[PDB]
Symmetry: C7
Subunit: 280 residues, 7 copies
């Protein structure tokens, strides 16, 4: 905060009195079902050392949460998204450099509560001691892959979910008899195996309705660069696990395998710094 | 935001120093009772790559929470809204594309609190470990259908609901003796079955009064397209369920059927980019 | 909201660079005791599709909370406002339409808490699982009746009220021995029936002091309409109830009859779009 | 509020590009100790169809919390401010009308919580059901008395108070042994009665240090009125209760009598709309 | 506040397009040790009825918390600030009046929570009807004492204090065996009586460090007045107490005497409205 | 709040339409490790009464938390910063004065809650009364020493600290078995005496990494003074304590000797009001 | 802030009406994998005493969390980032001085609570006393190393961590049988030693993905300096640790080594105050 260092607010900011040539590009990948969008703004400031270009990656990635296997009334499958990833990279040959990005990793806190109690009866003298720890855990965690000079990537992993108002079930949770109960409509059920799956409405929205990222990255050019034409690549992804239920003659049992499938988009864009346009 | 990435706030924004032409096309579907409004804008910033068009989707969908069946004093049925939906789409042959949309899927969080307590009842000894989980359950969930270019839609599904201050009930809730008690006024009642239903005032406002969507979508078209004219369709689907009450012998019984009826009200609007006006 | 789509704040809004002819109309209905006021503004934008007219229906509706009947010292009555309502409609033959009707309906929420604990005495064991549900109950809840193209109306109805720090005591609460105790000052009292009623100060303010509404509605008129003159109604209402106490020789009993009386006051205004003035 | 209808913020407000002639009028009623302050402002908008005059009713009403008389060492009295009022009447002959006023009645609220816990012991399986209800209780309630065309008034009443950090006593509380203990310093006291009252510092500030009003009443007058002059009357007043306590030879007993003394301070102001100034 | 009456925010305010003088009359009273400052501001608005003058009485009053007397290890004294005060007065013959003042008395609030729980064993069934009531209480209370036309005064009384986390103690707290133990370091102490006092650091800051007023007043004088000179007086009195502590041969006993000493300054200032300057 | 008296916000502030000549002076005291800094600003508003100068002693003071002496494994010492101080002083004969200072003593509040519970078995009707009191207590508590006319000084002391999640300890804490366990690693560890100390990271940051003050004072000097030169003195004194642990027979014993060493670093500045530069 | 002192907000700030030369330098270190950049502004306010320069330290330090060693299934190591540190120092020969730095050490707080209850049975009575304190402890705590005239540096250190929801573990935690369980997935399992480690996703984001500094620094120069060229060194760091799991033939045992590897990346930048550019 500039105001903390006695500097007038906004003095250190950039972009004053300088025109910006914004833009927009929309693409839909029918095969993978991820509507991709890239909102770019070309900021050049005569005061600033080098040109700027902020590249939003709004888009959206479909959940793709559906039962894919119908072996019978004894066992069935299910494929759900376990990680949405979008990463931008530049060719190693190019001279453009990634300067900033957002969001970024943040520290997480916890609340600690100690206790100590005395008691007198009548002639009892009971004593009690207790410690309670509280923290907030989201269903999906947004992570920023290690950003290097030429590429930055984000992830949205599946932390855990609450099923039928029962304790959160992690992706690797296991039970001695029932097995992993991540998506199990009924434990001691009698319907068809395909029917016995948690309704997509009850689950988190991201699983079935998809995830809509909003990530910002800014790249710069030496203002005296001999070449003013750099290509950039944006890659979307979706890692889908495999959840299967089978009947053990007494109760349903569920098993999960991690990173069963994966699909990418890999769109390539062409940046023209001289004319301040990015079309592809 | 831009301030966090050192970019002055509003630098990468659109619509500055450009005239915008708006409108408030409105319509009412008397048959389905869906007063639908469309408030559009035609921001045409010269710096931007493509033309813009922001289409608000204000209006309302009537709840239609009424008792329709009067088979007798022993049985009766009720019809209530289970999901309000509103959608936009463009013909495939058109070149305009859907760029953004404000209401979007968001991640949910839970507060997990552990515990551990041991005391001595001085000879004596005790130990206790506990886990607790907290989260908010909205009555209706505003989830966004998987969006694609030339088609975007929203839904408002029915989550669990609380009646008579007792435990929350949902569409699939079942009780072996009483059945689904979603809208059951009394258990050991003696008055007419049709009269035995939860008062609409006690229920959620959306069921009786109705739902008023407020969703925003923005369409962009190429600045040098061959034809500056596109047609867009807007739909206001509603889905209802059938809730049945009958006298088993000593207590009431509640049965619910999912997605019984459905009302759709589609209207086609014509967009004229050259004149910057939209006609219904 | 608007800034999430990267659009400049307030760009999609209207009413900029244009003069607005505000106004005010006040009237008092001595017979029904409701001080009704109407504040209007004419927003004529050259950019906007059609003319606008924003109606604020501010005013006040007297509570009228008093004992109306006095039949000896054994039983007496009471009349209190069950629900205040204000409506607004246009003649069918008119061409003006209702566009927006803020405030609208909102989605309720609740917090679900789940617990699970263990124990070990001193050999011994113990298990306890329990869930708690919390939510907020307003005394009066405003509802937006289904608005059509020509009429929109709000209503504020009676929810439960804490009496002497006791339970909710909603309108239809019944007790086998004491009966409905909504406004019962004392259970086993010995004073006169008429004087035995909850003091208006202890009760909610709206019951005895009145409800002052603030609802906004905007009606649009085609810019090239052949006839500019239109008409409005602006109807207020107040539905009372009858609460009676009688002595059963052992304790007081209370009974309530819903919607015993209804008094409504209407006054149609004339709109003059050409003059941009509205007269009562 | 206004921005939700897509109207730019402040578009529908008034007072733009105008010269409001404010003022001030201070009076002190040493007989009743009621400081008066009638800050006003004449908002003349050419767009608005009527003149405006917002009357701020600031001031202060002294608490007047003292032992008015003592009768021996076993009887004493105390007079405390039961309720403050501020009335702003307007002669029915005049044609000016009150348009708005602030503050106004607001809807209360309360949180409701429900519990359901059942455990097992090793096995005395138990079940527990419980519900809690919480709400805020201001010491003094600012109730807006039912307004009309020519008269608007406010009042501040005594909700209840906590005495010695034990019990929220009120005017209606009664205990068969000790009686009303609203301002009883000690139960089994042995001190003189005249000095057995709760210290004014421990009590609420408004009881002894006074209440400072803050109210607004905008009154509008027709612009083509025959005479541009309307006198107005503004009334302050407080209602005092006599709190008697005496010794029953075993313990102190206290009784409270409601509305014992009432003192009204009335002032008349002449308004000159043409001159835009009102004189004392 | 002002925007709720549909009046544009800041319209009714005062002080626009008018120049205002200021000053920092500052004095120090070495005998009483209270840094005295008076920041005045002269406002002469052509639209306003009168001429304003805002006198901010910010300053500082030393705590003066020390052991005043020492008469052997058997007993010792202590003097601490019981209450701070500050007030402004005008001569009766003057024509200036106090317009407004700040801060002012405020209404307290409390949270009241009810409860009701059932139970079943195995047989045995229990019940519970417990209550609860919580509120926030500052140790020092700032209450505006009744202001007359020529006089306004504030005070900061001592409400109560927490000693060694052993519950709140006030000036009237009494214990049969230990007596008033407000500032008692140890109960069964054995060191010197003077040494057995609560460390000033552990106590509240105001007791030993001082209090910094931030009060404000406004004075108005009719512009067409024969005499444009007025004299105003300001007082900064502090009220002390005695907390003599003595040993009863078994444990320390603390006794407190209320309002032992008092000291004040009473500086006089001269106001020159014509020159818009205030002379020390 | 200046807006609560109807005065327009910022009217009474000083600094409009004037030029302020700010500055900065940085100096580091290698002997005491205190990076002191002052940031001044000369404000001379012609509408004001006296020249102004605000001195912000930002600076920074090291922690100096290390074991000063060790004597075998039998015992060892430790020196930690007990309190940080910074003060500004003026010559006794000087004509400038201290007017204001931002950080000032503030009143502290504490919550309070009273519980009353009834019960009924089968029958054993029990009762329970409870008092709960909670408050927030920082580790280091800033205090403003009594400010006189010439010198104003702040102070930061050691309130208490939480060690190994155990009950908070303070300088005066004593335990008959272990003693003052403030900076104690293990109660009966077998490590070396010097090694058995709380890790600086586990302790508060201020103890080891220093304290960076931010205090503001404003100095006003008459504009007609014969001499326009003033001298200032700024001190950054810091007080350390001596903490020693001792092995008696089996367990470690800790003792604290408060106010052992004090480090002062005073520097004299010269102010030139005429040239508006403070240099030294 | 300045508002409290009656100084208009922003009056004492700097950087007004003066152009600031801005820039950005970005570099990546393949060996240590820490993407580092510095964002600088050359503020040259003519009113200010000295030329000013604000240096950011935005970037990222890779987590580097992987199993470095694999020695059969008996045991295997793991290296994780113990603390990320970034420094910034000037040569002792230079004359530029470090003025300020935004992130600084802050004082923490605790929420202490006290309890006291009474009980009565039937006939026996009981008493209880309780103390509880609450505080928030982040996983990573950023600490500002003691700054001086030339060198300034920050650090972020590993404070605590919750493993599998089973209490917080720190580097100093020890268990007599299991040992340090900081990153031990299963207490006893048949998997390989390398396989048995806490999944990086379950761990904190900083450990696996990395830490992104956002620190700020300010540097001043005498405006009359003989030379206008200053070299500055920017140093990043990452202190590693060694975590190893053994097998005692019954359960896994974990040992942690503190500060095993430290890899630091140093960069030297040259500043040209005349040209207002920091080359590289």
């Amino acid at each position: 905060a500039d105001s903390d260092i006695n500097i007038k607010t906004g003095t250190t900011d950039i972009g004053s009195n300088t025109t910006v040539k914004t833009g927009d590009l929309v693409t839909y990948d029918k095969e993978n079902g991820m509507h991709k969008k890239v909102f770019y703004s070309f900021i050049d400031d005569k005061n600033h050392n080098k040109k700027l270009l902020v590249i939003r990656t709004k888009g959206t990635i479909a959940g793709q949460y559906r039962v894919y296997s119908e072996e019978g009334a004894n066992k069935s499958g299910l494929a759900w998204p376990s990680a949405f990833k979008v990463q931008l990279q530049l060719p190693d040959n190019e001279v453009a450099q990634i300067s900033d990005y957002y969001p970024r990793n943040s520290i997480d806190t916890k609340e600690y509560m100690s206790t100590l109690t005395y008691g007198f009866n009548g002639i009892g003298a009971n004593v009690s001691i207790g410690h309670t720890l509280k923290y907030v855990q989201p269903d999906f965690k947004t992570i920023l892959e290690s950003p290097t000079d030429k590429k930055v990537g984000w992830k949205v992993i599946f932390n855990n979910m609450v099923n039928q108002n029962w304790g959160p079930y992690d992706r690797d949770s296991w039970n001695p008899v029932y097995g992993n109960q991540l998506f199990m409509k009924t434990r001691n059920g009698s319907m068809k195996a395909a029917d016995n799956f948690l309704d997509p409405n009850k689950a988190s929205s991201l699983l079935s309705s998809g995830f809509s990222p909003d990530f910002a990255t800014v790249i710069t050019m030496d203002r005296k660069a001999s070449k003013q034409q750099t290509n950039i690549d944006v890659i979307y992804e979706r890692v889908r696990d495999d959840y299967q239920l089978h009947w053990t003659s007494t109760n349903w049992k569920g098993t999960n395998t991690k990173d069963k499938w994966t699909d990418r988009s890999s769109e390539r864009y062409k940046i023209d710094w001289e004319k301040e346009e990015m079309t592809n």
